[PDB]
Amino acid sequence: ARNPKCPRIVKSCHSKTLDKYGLIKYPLTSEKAMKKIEEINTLVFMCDKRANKKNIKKSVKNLFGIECDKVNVLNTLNGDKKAYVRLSGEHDALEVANKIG
Amino acid sequence: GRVIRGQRKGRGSIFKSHNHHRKGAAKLRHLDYCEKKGYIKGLVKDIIHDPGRGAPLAKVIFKRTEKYGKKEELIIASEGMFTGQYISCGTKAPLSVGNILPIGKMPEGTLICNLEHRTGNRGTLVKASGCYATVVGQSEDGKKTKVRLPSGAKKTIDAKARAMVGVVGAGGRIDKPILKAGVAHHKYRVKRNCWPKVRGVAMNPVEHPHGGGNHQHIGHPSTVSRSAPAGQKVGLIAARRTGLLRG
Amino acid sequence: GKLLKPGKVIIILNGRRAGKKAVIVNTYEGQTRERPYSYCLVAGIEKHPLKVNKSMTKKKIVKRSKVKAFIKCINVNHILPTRYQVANDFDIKSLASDDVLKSKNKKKEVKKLGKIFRDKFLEPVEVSKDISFLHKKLYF
Amino acid sequence: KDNPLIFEKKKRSNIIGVGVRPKKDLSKYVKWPRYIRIQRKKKILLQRLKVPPSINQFNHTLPKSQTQDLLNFLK
Amino acid sequence: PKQITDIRKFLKISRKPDTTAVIIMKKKSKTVITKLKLRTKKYLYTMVFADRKKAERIENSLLPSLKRIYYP
RNA sequence: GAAAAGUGUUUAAAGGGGUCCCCGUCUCAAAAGGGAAACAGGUUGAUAUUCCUGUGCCAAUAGUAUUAUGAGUU
RNA sequence: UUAUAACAAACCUUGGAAUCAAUUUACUUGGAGAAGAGGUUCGUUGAACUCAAUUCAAAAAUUUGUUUUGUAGCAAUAGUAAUUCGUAAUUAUCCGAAGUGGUAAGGACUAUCCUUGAAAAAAGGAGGGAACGGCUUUGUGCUUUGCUACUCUUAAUACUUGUAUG
RNA sequence: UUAUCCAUUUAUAGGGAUGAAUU
Ligand SMILES: [Mg+2]
Ligand SMILES: [Mg+2]
Ligand SMILES: [Mg+2]
Ligand SMILES: [Mg+2]
Ligand SMILES: [Mg+2]
Ligand SMILES: [Mg+2]
Ligand SMILES: [Mg+2]
Ligand SMILES: [Mg+2]
Ligand SMILES: [Mg+2]
Ligand SMILES: [Mg+2]
Ligand SMILES: [Mg+2]
């Protein structure tokens, strides 16, 4: 069991680890994403390469009035994660789209 | 010149044994208090092929005297052993085919196999299919025993040294001709890559003492000294005589 | 003679009671449309008294030596009869009743049998070899 | 209690090479670490060899009581 | 997907509160056959009735908080 | 072995399982060997056993307390 | 565990086999128990079979007869081919026999080998009999005293514990 | 024999007279 008289390294700086702002970067337009928004209430977000599904969900919860049933993700060949977020039935992605912009 | 085929073998690369399918090493029991002072009986639970060998194995199960559990040995099967036979091992064992006894306790003439040359060696001599040794005498001093190995050689061993009464299974396997090259192929395919043997005399000089010539002939005496080096030791090594054996 | 006389102890060889030792109570040997085989009717022990030390306390010993019994009609070809006979140490007619094999409260009967067995084990007598044999679980 | 058959054990067990044996201490057989084993062996070696007189004279070490008395005096 | 044959069992299932939806289907037989499906959290239980009136009666019987889906 | 490297239990005080005993080198090596579980239909300009509708399946699911579900024992 | 059916095996009971018998394309098998008679199981398969339901009528403490359904559920709501009607909706169809033996898989076997044809994670089963109710009170986890809902078991629900589903 | 060397095993009882076997 450790009992160091002082800790070795103490990062006093504000955390570098990615917050909501930084994790999730921006929604996608593109005809595909628009279609998704219209038809099956799935919002498409470009996110950081090092976002997990859990993390993305958390971000979405924090950044917007969104509850997400399921999140699929993929790594784009442009070095971004694209997260397809299916909203719970209580919410209309269209309305939330409008709210965001 | 080049490195001869023989020399290549020692580096063991492709010339290692084909060890993969083998069932394990064939060994007698560890030399416990039981086997030294009395007898232990085990069941031959199954008799099995061990690939690269010519002699079938017997998986014999013993009960461990110092912890509750069954443990398996791999014995070489003497002819006449069978599944569900009891095999007994120890100083005070009875003299039956299959059983494992110190050579001191077998009268002359008895036929044995899996013989330890030193006590505890887990059995080392007379293992090949068909082979057996003979107890030829025990000295009035006790202690040592005289045995005659399949070669013909007579050797003196400790009487405490263990052995297995009977002859090794799969006898006469050499009686049947291999006939086909392929059957030899299959034989060595399970042992190690020693087959085809190209003749030194069919090689070039870089490759072999015998290599080259406009004729295919060895060209120099093919009896080589004991005290030759690696690439010289090639024909009849250290040959005391040569030619059709008359004796 | 007639190997299986009422009271003889047998080893069941077949079924759920596979290696259990038991007392035959009434042999029939009459083949019928119902049971086309000579059958024996047997009262036996499923779960023997566990091993017990002098050191142990009396209640705990009693608990340990509970003996869980069973009553089963069985083909005589499935039972290995023994030399051991317990016509004496039990009133044998009292163990199993033919009629009660059919009856609803069979479990009650079984319980009673078990209790009787336990009692017998507690008071051995002088000490019969048969009873000793019955006591010991068969190890196979 | 005192019943013949409730407490009857089949304890007549031990014949050679049949059934697990009873038990022994095993101290004689335990492997021990390399160091400590060497010390043990070293001691034995020392005992065993012909020890030169001077060295030997370093292990005739008084009688115990007398030594204790001496120590007390020194105190 | 499971089939049910004991009407009583079906009723019991219906009574149980994880049964959110009923699906009631009408099928021209080779008369009007009726398939009663209950959508439980675990399984989709279905009962087939040859007899329309009986089917109707059982539908009526079904708790009025069920989320009834009339397919065709 | 000057090291670089070469060998891998050869003379080790080499992490797990139970309530001190009992096991026991580590690690990588298979996108054709071993192996928890998925199907159908629909949908896009470009993806689909991966999205949609439907229908399942597998593995988890900490404690404490209620509920119900059935067993067993009195 | 798809329910059942049918089938190659394996086993059980009964039965007691030479005038040998059963039996395969092949040989295999039998007093260490064959044939015959009745069963059990695994495996194929995955709705076969009256399979399930219902129709009513008769017999016991529930089984037989007749009929109508169900593409067994999934499942027709989906597909396909049609037919219209509108500027997406309706309808009608989807079902009775069988052969060939190309491919795959399984089965039971038989044969060859101086060739006998990986391992482990993981899982399971067995053997064994360690340990053993709960609550309340007293004394130093253990013992004594008194009362009867208990020990499991899934599922849901609630609440603290880092946010207890992928 | 104690150096050294080899073997054997879990370093498992000091020397002699086709079931089970563990708390
Ligand atoms: Mg992915
Ligand atoms: Mg040759
Ligand atoms: Mg040649
Ligand atoms: Mg040439
Ligand atoms: Mg040369
Ligand atoms: Mg030439
Ligand atoms: Mg020539
Ligand atoms: Mg790996
Ligand atoms: Mg694979
Ligand atoms: Mg494409
Ligand atoms: Mg249609």
PDB file of C-alpha atoms (C1' of nucleotides) in Angstrom, chain D residues 18 20-21 24 29 31 41 48-49, chain H residues 1-3 11-14 21-22:
ATOM      1  CA  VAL D  18      -2.681 -49.412  -1.462  1.00  0.00           C
ATOM      2  CA  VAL D  20      -3.555 -43.085   0.418  1.00  0.00           C
ATOM      3  CA  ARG D  21      -1.049 -43.330   3.258  1.00  0.00           C
ATOM      4  CA  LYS D  24       4.255 -37.476   7.909  1.00  0.00           C
ATOM      5  CA  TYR D  29      12.012 -33.448   2.015  1.00  0.00           C
ATOM      6  CA  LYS D  31      13.201 -28.157  -1.164  1.00  0.00           C
ATOM      7  CA  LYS D  41      25.241 -27.584   3.347  1.00  0.00           C
ATOM      8  CA  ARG D  48      32.921 -32.979   7.533  1.00  0.00           C
ATOM      9  CA  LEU D  49      36.306 -31.623   6.383  1.00  0.00           C
TER      10      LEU D  49
ATOM     11  C1'   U H   1      32.951 -39.088   1.376  1.00  0.00           C
ATOM     12  C1'   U H   2      32.512 -33.336   1.461  1.00  0.00           C
ATOM     13  C1'   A H   3      34.631 -30.982  -3.961  1.00  0.00           C
ATOM     14  C1'   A H  11      12.727 -33.127  -4.345  1.00  0.00           C
ATOM     15  C1'   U H  12       6.956 -37.057  -0.743  1.00  0.00           C
ATOM     16  C1'   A H  13       7.209 -42.790   4.451  1.00  0.00           C
ATOM     17  C1'   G H  14      15.117 -43.852   7.943  1.00  0.00           C
ATOM     18  C1'   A H  21      -9.987 -46.227  -1.147  1.00  0.00           C
ATOM     19  C1'   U H  22      -9.551 -38.284   0.328  1.00  0.00           C
TER      20        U H  22
END
